[PDB]
Amino acid sequence: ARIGEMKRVTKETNVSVKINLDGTGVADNSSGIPFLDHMLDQLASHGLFDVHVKATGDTHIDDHHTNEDVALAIGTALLQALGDRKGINRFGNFSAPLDEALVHVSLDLSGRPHLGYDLNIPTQRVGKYDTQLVEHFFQSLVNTSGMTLHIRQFSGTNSHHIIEATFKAFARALRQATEYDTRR
Amino acid sequence: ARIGEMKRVTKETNVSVKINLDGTGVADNSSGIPFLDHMLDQLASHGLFDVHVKATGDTHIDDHHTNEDVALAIGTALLQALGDRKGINRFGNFSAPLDEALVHVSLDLSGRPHLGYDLNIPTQRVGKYDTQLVEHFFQSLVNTSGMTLHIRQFSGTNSHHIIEATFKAFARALRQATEYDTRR
Amino acid sequence: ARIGEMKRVTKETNVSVKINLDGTGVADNSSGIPFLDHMLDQLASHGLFDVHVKATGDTHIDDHHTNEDVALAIGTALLQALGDRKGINRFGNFSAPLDEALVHVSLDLSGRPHLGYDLNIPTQRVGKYDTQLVEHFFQSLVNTSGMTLHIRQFSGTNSHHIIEATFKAFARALRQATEYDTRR
Amino acid sequence: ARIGEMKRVTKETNVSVKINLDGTGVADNSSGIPFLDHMLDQLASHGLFDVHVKATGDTHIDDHHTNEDVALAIGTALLQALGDRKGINRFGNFSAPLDEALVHVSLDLSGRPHLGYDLNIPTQRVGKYDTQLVEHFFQSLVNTSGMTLHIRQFSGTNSHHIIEATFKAFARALRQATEYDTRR
Amino acid sequence: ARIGEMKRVTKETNVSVKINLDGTGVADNSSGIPFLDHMLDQLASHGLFDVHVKATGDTHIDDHHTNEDVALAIGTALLQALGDRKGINRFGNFSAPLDEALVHVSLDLSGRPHLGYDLNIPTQRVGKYDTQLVEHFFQSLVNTSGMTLHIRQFSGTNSHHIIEATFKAFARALRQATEYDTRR
Amino acid sequence: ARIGEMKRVTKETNVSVKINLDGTGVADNSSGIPFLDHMLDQLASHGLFDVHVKATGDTHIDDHHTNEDVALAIGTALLQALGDRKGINRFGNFSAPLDEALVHVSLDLSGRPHLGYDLNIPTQRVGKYDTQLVEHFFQSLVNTSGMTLHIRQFSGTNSHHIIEATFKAFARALRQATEYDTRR
Ligand SMILES: [Mn+2]
Ligand SMILES: [Mn+2]
Ligand SMILES: [Mn+2]
Ligand SMILES: [Mn+2]
Ligand SMILES: [Mn+2]
Ligand SMILES: [Mn+2]
Ligand SMILES: [Mn+2]
Ligand SMILES: [Mn+2]
Ligand SMILES: [Mn+2]
Ligand SMILES: [Mn+2]
Ligand SMILES: [Mn+2]
Ligand SMILES: [Mn+2]
């Protein structure tokens, strides 16, 4: 079983993250951003990962500093759990429909960080969550994990449906890339 | 050491401000606007100034009256600390990058107030802070300090990055203008 | 194990080609076009095929006649190795990301030749290789193998990345079409 | 004196790189790309760095693989020479004129990689050097060094002048960011 | 101390010019064009140069012949004072704000003459001075001094403010280029 | 007989140039750029000049540095051969047709350098010669000779015809300007 963990203390945030690639879908997420916790639970259920996030920070100013630090910690823990990446598929593709929304995700674990972001979120706030942080979350994740990620939206009107369809497609594409190849 | 202070009591706000131009970066800022306190801390760290702000006011209506009165007090304290402005550079230029954002600041301490504002902030709120108050803050500062200030944005998408890059470039351009010229 | 071979002698070129569909990724390619050899190696590694190409020709005039004859020989050897095509999937789909580039390939082995080509290569030369020969290579391959092939580009700026992402997606889509179906 | 070195052996390239930040401008560059060696010499002379590059590779196919591997090695050696980055300016700005060309460079050493590229090179080849590799060189450098880099062109017609003005502005902006701050 | 002088007698003008690069700002300018004398005084004060100009000519026809001959003499005296240009920075950059006006100047002392002029002066006369002579002054200066000069305007409405901001930025950029570099 | 010579040694090029204005058309040109030698021969035959150029340089990088240094040496040798320019026409005009191409050249020897370039060369390479160097050649020639030169194209499609018609018109216009005026 491949397991990654990370702990970082700064002047703004305290974050502890644990990821298990060979899991059954256990989700224990508790940060100061309730909507981000809803998103991280879908990554565990649809990807069959074990995700544990504990974070506290200066949310009285904004959610920006907490959102950025959580994404960096998840990316670092993913890199250490992967190790040498020998015998894995390294490629993942998935399209996820959610009512009127449809998002396609293509990723490859290569060591070269790149993000291709094409999303059109109509509203500025979903709950208390600022929708500009969706791009910032995925940009910080690929900078520490060294992955190439492409996200494209084909349809969608509702802000909740578009974002939560994106996390479903990312979880299942990451699962396919991390499974061992059966060779011939 | 050049030190300026100001104290003003009105029917809406009570403000006390202390500025030291020859400092080491001590920041003690406490008003009713948490995001403005985050911005004023960067002016102390990047500009090597000592900034102390204490303010209370009618924030139950809006942040407008408190934001305006703090900016006027900072400008007045800056003017008294400068004094005769003899032997100083009087000019400052700096461009500050922050991820995808890039802001250039040009200022000159001449006694003639003028503001050139060219910023494109995409969202209406960052946290609880209204983004229309960024222009109002800098307009009130140059009216009491008598400075010529130009702000121009070359790139940027994130609202937090654009504003906080502006304060970094302003702090380092003000620091260069207040240093003593070495002559030949 | 399904193995195909071909040998053709004309007044311009001499070509010998051997293909093994049940392979481990052995690549032995030696023609007069170094960039084409780089492309054919990726088909062996990503598709788990055994590819052997030996060719000599009148490269002092152009690479056109050598490039065309190699593609025809590969298509003929593929057809003979497939045989009756009984019990195979016959369909393959894959999207391959390579930094900023993203290419999708859809193919089906039906006996009816058709090529759908949608690529936008910005430069005229990559090394010494003429970029007009990428279309000519795939058109000659489907004319002798009798396959329906669709290629579409979604993003990309670098000429090397776009072409070499196309060969990766073609290799993995061809591999999926040639595997035996497990039925129920 | 801060010195960084790197050695990487792959199936395509062999690269050894040595960088000294406290140097006098010694340049010893020898790869398979003569135009890149001309560019790396200007970084030593204008930046007062000591740069040593030795590389061999499969240039018979293209210059792509050699150009990419050299840029990655330089970025890694720069990161190790910087160390904790304590007491340095961390910011650099410079505009460099070269006849009709004018390029501005803004950089900051923060640990977050980002590239802003705005160049308009009119021709496809300068000598034997492919002009698409100028972007690929700077993208690979910031991915391993963790720096934020912005490049903007204001004028220029000649391809040689535009590129070689870019390297002059980058060298002097990097020099300013690596000097120790004098504090008060 | 580096000092340059020039004396030229033609059928239209008599000009004597003396320039000292290591000065304290002494200005003694007396030609037949009062507005040009106002401009040359700012070059001495802001650049810390010693400038002495004495000229008489056929101003009853136009100011063209006198303006052209003064600029040629200043450029020649600057070249002789520079000498071998060993140990100097050779590069200068400055942006100067003057109320609503903002002008940026970039120069380099290389021996190759080039002028990049981008100014938008709204009126045809400032006092008795023809505004077409601003371009003619700087073109004649770079032809005799062998310098590369770029001038760009970012804002401005008043003709007096735009021109006199240009001379301020040119003086401080020339001062930076002529100072001795401190090396490491 | 008016004869000019020049010899310059730099770190990149070694150039020796000899020009005779009262000649019979002897051409002895040998540099590392064969197409430039073809152009310089037409200047001797059509202008009745004696031109001798010997140059070696770092052509393994590019032809840029060799092309620039040859043009500077020719311009300097032309200036010294002219001397006081007493009794000469100082003006030259010629239009040269070459099949479908037609180029007009107007020049005047005044001591004030200026280049007016209006050419539309359709291709990027003629042989191994980069077509961007045609402008760079004539710009460097007028900077050292102090001449005013205007070049305008009225028709033409073939790259070889357009360039070689330009050199024919320049040679005959320069010949007319250097002949002694017969007065009344
Ligand atoms: Mn951020
Ligand atoms: Mn939901
Ligand atoms: Mn107000
Ligand atoms: Mn912040
Ligand atoms: Mn053909
Ligand atoms: Mn490759
Ligand atoms: Mn690459
Ligand atoms: Mn060069
Ligand atoms: Mn004139
Ligand atoms: Mn004035
Ligand atoms: Mn040049
Ligand atoms: Mn010819």
PDB file of C-alpha atoms in Angstrom, chain F residues 38-183:
ATOM      1  CA  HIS F  38      27.850  37.950 -55.670  1.00  0.00           C
ATOM      2  CA  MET F  39      26.259  41.251 -54.618  1.00  0.00           C
ATOM      3  CA  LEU F  40      29.568  43.074 -54.108  1.00  0.00           C
ATOM      4  CA  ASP F  41      30.756  42.095 -57.597  1.00  0.00           C
ATOM      5  CA  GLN F  42      27.818  43.948 -59.175  1.00  0.00           C
ATOM      6  CA  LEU F  43      28.818  47.111 -57.303  1.00  0.00           C
ATOM      7  CA  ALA F  44      32.224  46.992 -59.009  1.00  0.00           C
ATOM      8  CA  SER F  45      30.937  46.245 -62.519  1.00  0.00           C
ATOM      9  CA  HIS F  46      28.002  48.671 -62.600  1.00  0.00           C
ATOM     10  CA  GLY F  47      29.680  51.413 -60.555  1.00  0.00           C
ATOM     11  CA  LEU F  48      33.152  51.114 -62.143  1.00  0.00           C
ATOM     12  CA  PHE F  49      34.700  50.867 -58.672  1.00  0.00           C
ATOM     13  CA  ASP F  50      37.572  48.697 -57.455  1.00  0.00           C
ATOM     14  CA  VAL F  51      36.317  46.669 -54.482  1.00  0.00           C
ATOM     15  CA  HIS F  52      38.475  44.302 -52.418  1.00  0.00           C
ATOM     16  CA  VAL F  53      37.032  42.551 -49.354  1.00  0.00           C
ATOM     17  CA  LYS F  54      38.715  39.862 -47.242  1.00  0.00           C
ATOM     18  CA  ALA F  55      36.909  38.584 -44.159  1.00  0.00           C
ATOM     19  CA  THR F  56      36.788  35.574 -41.850  1.00  0.00           C
ATOM     20  CA  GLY F  57      34.598  35.058 -38.822  1.00  0.00           C
ATOM     21  CA  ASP F  58      32.323  32.872 -36.723  1.00  0.00           C
ATOM     22  CA  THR F  59      29.974  31.778 -39.488  1.00  0.00           C
ATOM     23  CA  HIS F  60      29.307  28.507 -37.630  1.00  0.00           C
ATOM     24  CA  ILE F  61      26.869  30.444 -35.421  1.00  0.00           C
ATOM     25  CA  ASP F  62      25.306  32.814 -37.968  1.00  0.00           C
ATOM     26  CA  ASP F  63      26.114  35.190 -40.810  1.00  0.00           C
ATOM     27  CA  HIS F  64      24.947  38.161 -38.710  1.00  0.00           C
ATOM     28  CA  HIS F  65      28.253  39.212 -37.142  1.00  0.00           C
ATOM     29  CA  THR F  66      30.225  38.865 -40.394  1.00  0.00           C
ATOM     30  CA  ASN F  67      27.605  40.737 -42.445  1.00  0.00           C
ATOM     31  CA  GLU F  68      27.501  43.630 -39.962  1.00  0.00           C
ATOM     32  CA  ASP F  69      31.284  44.057 -39.741  1.00  0.00           C
ATOM     33  CA  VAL F  70      31.797  44.076 -43.522  1.00  0.00           C
ATOM     34  CA  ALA F  71      29.223  46.856 -43.971  1.00  0.00           C
ATOM     35  CA  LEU F  72      30.840  49.026 -41.286  1.00  0.00           C
ATOM     36  CA  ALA F  73      34.282  48.663 -42.884  1.00  0.00           C
ATOM     37  CA  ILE F  74      33.018  49.582 -46.365  1.00  0.00           C
ATOM     38  CA  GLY F  75      31.333  52.712 -45.014  1.00  0.00           C
ATOM     39  CA  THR F  76      34.458  53.896 -43.196  1.00  0.00           C
ATOM     40  CA  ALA F  77      36.696  53.358 -46.239  1.00  0.00           C
ATOM     41  CA  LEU F  78      34.219  55.265 -48.418  1.00  0.00           C
ATOM     42  CA  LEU F  79      34.309  58.258 -46.055  1.00  0.00           C
ATOM     43  CA  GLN F  80      38.107  58.518 -46.068  1.00  0.00           C
ATOM     44  CA  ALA F  81      38.326  58.243 -49.864  1.00  0.00           C
ATOM     45  CA  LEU F  82      35.808  61.078 -50.292  1.00  0.00           C
ATOM     46  CA  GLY F  83      37.872  63.518 -48.234  1.00  0.00           C
ATOM     47  CA  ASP F  84      36.599  67.090 -48.401  1.00  0.00           C
ATOM     48  CA  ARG F  85      33.992  66.272 -51.108  1.00  0.00           C
ATOM     49  CA  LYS F  86      34.851  69.466 -53.005  1.00  0.00           C
ATOM     50  CA  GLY F  87      33.723  69.804 -56.611  1.00  0.00           C
ATOM     51  CA  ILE F  88      31.534  66.683 -56.696  1.00  0.00           C
ATOM     52  CA  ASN F  89      27.854  66.366 -57.588  1.00  0.00           C
ATOM     53  CA  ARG F  90      26.900  64.959 -54.118  1.00  0.00           C
ATOM     54  CA  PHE F  91      23.549  63.722 -55.515  1.00  0.00           C
ATOM     55  CA  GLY F  92      22.585  60.516 -57.287  1.00  0.00           C
ATOM     56  CA  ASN F  93      19.362  59.038 -58.676  1.00  0.00           C
ATOM     57  CA  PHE F  94      18.702  55.828 -60.597  1.00  0.00           C
ATOM     58  CA  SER F  95      15.922  53.330 -61.300  1.00  0.00           C
ATOM     59  CA  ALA F  96      17.002  49.805 -62.253  1.00  0.00           C
ATOM     60  CA  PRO F  97      14.726  47.238 -63.951  1.00  0.00           C
ATOM     61  CA  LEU F  98      15.448  43.513 -63.685  1.00  0.00           C
ATOM     62  CA  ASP F  99      12.731  41.440 -65.418  1.00  0.00           C
ATOM     63  CA  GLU F 100       9.585  42.049 -63.301  1.00  0.00           C
ATOM     64  CA  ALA F 101      11.469  43.939 -60.558  1.00  0.00           C
ATOM     65  CA  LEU F 102      12.002  47.708 -60.407  1.00  0.00           C
ATOM     66  CA  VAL F 103      13.870  49.539 -57.624  1.00  0.00           C
ATOM     67  CA  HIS F 104      14.617  53.265 -57.298  1.00  0.00           C
ATOM     68  CA  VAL F 105      17.526  54.631 -55.241  1.00  0.00           C
ATOM     69  CA  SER F 106      18.068  58.242 -54.135  1.00  0.00           C
ATOM     70  CA  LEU F 107      21.136  59.270 -52.142  1.00  0.00           C
ATOM     71  CA  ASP F 108      23.029  62.379 -51.069  1.00  0.00           C
ATOM     72  CA  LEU F 109      26.430  62.682 -49.360  1.00  0.00           C
ATOM     73  CA  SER F 110      25.833  65.257 -46.623  1.00  0.00           C
ATOM     74  CA  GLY F 111      27.348  63.998 -43.353  1.00  0.00           C
ATOM     75  CA  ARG F 112      23.935  63.282 -41.787  1.00  0.00           C
ATOM     76  CA  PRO F 113      23.111  59.541 -41.627  1.00  0.00           C
ATOM     77  CA  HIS F 114      19.580  58.433 -42.511  1.00  0.00           C
ATOM     78  CA  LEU F 115      18.099  55.307 -44.101  1.00  0.00           C
ATOM     79  CA  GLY F 116      14.714  55.031 -45.778  1.00  0.00           C
ATOM     80  CA  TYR F 117      14.014  51.355 -46.468  1.00  0.00           C
ATOM     81  CA  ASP F 118      10.925  50.188 -48.388  1.00  0.00           C
ATOM     82  CA  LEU F 119      11.447  46.643 -49.684  1.00  0.00           C
ATOM     83  CA  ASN F 120       9.133  43.616 -49.752  1.00  0.00           C
ATOM     84  CA  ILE F 121      11.185  40.415 -50.034  1.00  0.00           C
ATOM     85  CA  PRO F 122       8.742  37.468 -50.128  1.00  0.00           C
ATOM     86  CA  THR F 123      11.014  34.604 -49.021  1.00  0.00           C
ATOM     87  CA  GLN F 124      13.087  34.133 -45.874  1.00  0.00           C
ATOM     88  CA  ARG F 125      16.139  32.556 -47.556  1.00  0.00           C
ATOM     89  CA  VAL F 126      17.602  33.086 -51.023  1.00  0.00           C
ATOM     90  CA  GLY F 127      20.359  30.497 -50.828  1.00  0.00           C
ATOM     91  CA  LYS F 128      21.887  30.099 -47.394  1.00  0.00           C
ATOM     92  CA  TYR F 129      21.573  33.886 -46.983  1.00  0.00           C
ATOM     93  CA  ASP F 130      19.050  35.279 -44.504  1.00  0.00           C
ATOM     94  CA  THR F 131      16.998  38.033 -46.138  1.00  0.00           C
ATOM     95  CA  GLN F 132      16.764  40.067 -42.918  1.00  0.00           C
ATOM     96  CA  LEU F 133      20.445  40.979 -43.416  1.00  0.00           C
ATOM     97  CA  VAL F 134      19.751  43.153 -46.484  1.00  0.00           C
ATOM     98  CA  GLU F 135      18.354  45.912 -44.256  1.00  0.00           C
ATOM     99  CA  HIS F 136      21.126  45.423 -41.685  1.00  0.00           C
ATOM    100  CA  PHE F 137      23.799  45.792 -44.384  1.00  0.00           C
ATOM    101  CA  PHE F 138      22.571  49.171 -45.635  1.00  0.00           C
ATOM    102  CA  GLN F 139      21.867  50.525 -42.141  1.00  0.00           C
ATOM    103  CA  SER F 140      25.451  49.862 -41.028  1.00  0.00           C
ATOM    104  CA  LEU F 141      26.860  51.393 -44.222  1.00  0.00           C
ATOM    105  CA  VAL F 142      25.151  54.770 -43.766  1.00  0.00           C
ATOM    106  CA  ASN F 143      26.078  54.940 -40.067  1.00  0.00           C
ATOM    107  CA  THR F 144      29.815  55.044 -40.854  1.00  0.00           C
ATOM    108  CA  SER F 145      29.718  56.938 -44.171  1.00  0.00           C
ATOM    109  CA  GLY F 146      27.286  59.675 -43.088  1.00  0.00           C
ATOM    110  CA  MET F 147      24.957  59.513 -46.091  1.00  0.00           C
ATOM    111  CA  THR F 148      21.224  59.950 -46.665  1.00  0.00           C
ATOM    112  CA  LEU F 149      19.809  56.948 -48.534  1.00  0.00           C
ATOM    113  CA  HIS F 150      16.286  56.170 -49.770  1.00  0.00           C
ATOM    114  CA  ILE F 151      15.276  52.816 -51.288  1.00  0.00           C
ATOM    115  CA  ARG F 152      11.820  52.147 -52.747  1.00  0.00           C
ATOM    116  CA  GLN F 153      10.418  49.128 -54.598  1.00  0.00           C
ATOM    117  CA  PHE F 154       7.777  49.579 -57.302  1.00  0.00           C
ATOM    118  CA  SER F 155       7.392  45.972 -58.509  1.00  0.00           C
ATOM    119  CA  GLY F 156       8.907  42.527 -58.131  1.00  0.00           C
ATOM    120  CA  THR F 157       8.144  38.943 -57.125  1.00  0.00           C
ATOM    121  CA  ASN F 158      11.424  37.015 -57.264  1.00  0.00           C
ATOM    122  CA  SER F 159      13.709  37.407 -54.243  1.00  0.00           C
ATOM    123  CA  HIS F 160      16.951  37.107 -56.241  1.00  0.00           C
ATOM    124  CA  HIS F 161      15.795  39.708 -58.777  1.00  0.00           C
ATOM    125  CA  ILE F 162      14.642  42.245 -56.162  1.00  0.00           C
ATOM    126  CA  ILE F 163      17.856  42.262 -54.104  1.00  0.00           C
ATOM    127  CA  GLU F 164      20.240  42.230 -57.063  1.00  0.00           C
ATOM    128  CA  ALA F 165      18.303  45.049 -58.731  1.00  0.00           C
ATOM    129  CA  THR F 166      18.751  47.076 -55.527  1.00  0.00           C
ATOM    130  CA  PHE F 167      22.548  46.771 -55.672  1.00  0.00           C
ATOM    131  CA  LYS F 168      22.597  47.801 -59.345  1.00  0.00           C
ATOM    132  CA  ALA F 169      20.658  51.009 -58.665  1.00  0.00           C
ATOM    133  CA  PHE F 170      22.795  51.819 -55.614  1.00  0.00           C
ATOM    134  CA  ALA F 171      26.049  51.417 -57.560  1.00  0.00           C
ATOM    135  CA  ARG F 172      25.051  53.748 -60.403  1.00  0.00           C
ATOM    136  CA  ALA F 173      23.554  56.354 -58.058  1.00  0.00           C
ATOM    137  CA  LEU F 174      26.751  56.368 -55.982  1.00  0.00           C
ATOM    138  CA  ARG F 175      28.824  56.722 -59.158  1.00  0.00           C
ATOM    139  CA  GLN F 176      26.872  59.810 -60.240  1.00  0.00           C
ATOM    140  CA  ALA F 177      27.262  61.440 -56.818  1.00  0.00           C
ATOM    141  CA  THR F 178      31.048  60.972 -56.800  1.00  0.00           C
ATOM    142  CA  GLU F 179      31.804  62.378 -60.268  1.00  0.00           C
ATOM    143  CA  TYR F 180      33.257  65.873 -60.467  1.00  0.00           C
ATOM    144  CA  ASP F 181      30.837  68.593 -61.530  1.00  0.00           C
ATOM    145  CA  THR F 182      31.808  70.385 -64.743  1.00  0.00           C
ATOM    146  CA  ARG F 183      30.348  73.742 -63.527  1.00  0.00           C
TER     147      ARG F 183
END
